[PDB]
Amino acid sequence: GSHMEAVQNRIVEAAERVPGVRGVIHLRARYVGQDIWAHMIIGVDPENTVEQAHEICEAVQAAVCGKIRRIESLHVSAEARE
Amino acid sequence: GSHMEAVQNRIVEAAERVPGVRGVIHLRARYVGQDIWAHMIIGVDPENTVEQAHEICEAVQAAVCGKIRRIESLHVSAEARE
């Protein structure tokens, strides 16, 4: 239920502390048993390169999964944000 | 049960990221309903002043309670550690 809300706040806060993240644009997190599977979209600088945006996504995946132990799948993508 | 273990790891990691903490010496955390009440003892530099040790304890209380939302009481004390 709304113990999902507290986990979601953790996910957003963890993603936002990674260098290059300009906000979490979208987060869809689901329980698969006691595990969380999630998809997220982060904002990035429009003038970052596609490669850099991919690096930031992987840094976000690593930070979030590193801080939130119950997460077992996280897909991070990126969109331009000012 | 052992969802307490994951919360306890969060508490120790949060305390250890505060300036002046040389390890968590002791942590006793209990559920009061869905809330956690905790007592912890941190290690500090023997040559810190009593006042500085009190500051570090309050910084730990603030960091931990700030990161772990279900915590509703936390008492932090300090002991000398090399």
UniProtKB/Swiss-Prot annotation, chains A, B:
Disulfide bonds: none annotated. The gene is mamM. Fe cation 2 binds at H54. Changing M40P: Severely impaired magnetic response, cells make very few, small magnetite particles, less MamB and MamM protein accumulate. CTD no longer dimerizes, CTD has cannot fold properly and is unstable. Fe cation 3 binds at E79. Essential for magnetosome formation; required for stable accumulation of MamB. May nucleate iron crystal formation. Probably binds and transports iron. Binds divalent cations, possibly up to 3 Zn(2+) per dimer in vitro, probably iron in vivo. One of 7 genes (mamLQBIEMO) able to induce magnetosome membrane biogenesis; coexpression of mamLQRBIEMO in a deletion of the 17 gene mamAB operon restores magnetosome vesicle formation but not magnetite biosynthesis. This bacteria makes up to 60 cubo-octahedral magnetosomes of about 45 nm in diameter which contain membrane-bound crystals of magnetite (Fe(3)O(4)). Expression of just the minimal mamAB gene cluster (MGMSRv2__2365 to MGMSRv2__2381), including this gene, is sufficient to form a minimal magnetosome chain with small magnetite particles. It comes from the Bacteria. Forms homodimers via its C-terminal domain (CTD) in the presence of metal cations. Interacts with MamB via their CTD. Isolated CTD forms homodimers. The C-terminal domain (CTD) is probably responsible for hetero- and homodimerization; it assumes a V-shaped, dimeric metallo-chaperone-like fold that can open and close. Val-50 forms the hinge between the dimers. Binds up to 3 divalent metal cations (probably iron in vivo); upon binding there is a conformational shift to a tighter dimer. If the CTD cannot fold correctly the function of the whole protein is decreased, suggesting the CTD confers functionality on the transmembrane domain (TMD), perhaps activated by ligand binding to the CTD. Residues 5-82 are annotated as: C-terminal domain (CTD). Fe cation 1 binds at H39, H75. Belongs to the cation diffusion facilitator (CDF) transporter (TC 2.A.4) family. Induction: Part of the probable 17 gene mamAB operon. It is found in: Magnetosome membrane; Cell inner membrane. Disruption phenotype: Single gene disruption has no growth defects, no accumulation of magnetite, forms empty intracellular magnetosome vesicles, decreased levels of MamB, mislocation of MamC in 1-3 foci or rarely in a shortened chain. Magnetosome vesicles are fewer and smaller, aligned in a chain with the filament, only a few have very small crystals. Other, possibly precursor magnetosome vesicles are visible. MamI mislocalized to cell inner membrane or in 1 to a few patches. The chain holds residues 215 to 292 of 318 of the full protein. This is Magnetosome protein MamM. Changing V50R: Loss of magnetic response, still stabilizes MamB, CTD dimerizes, binds cations, dimer interface is tighter and twisted.
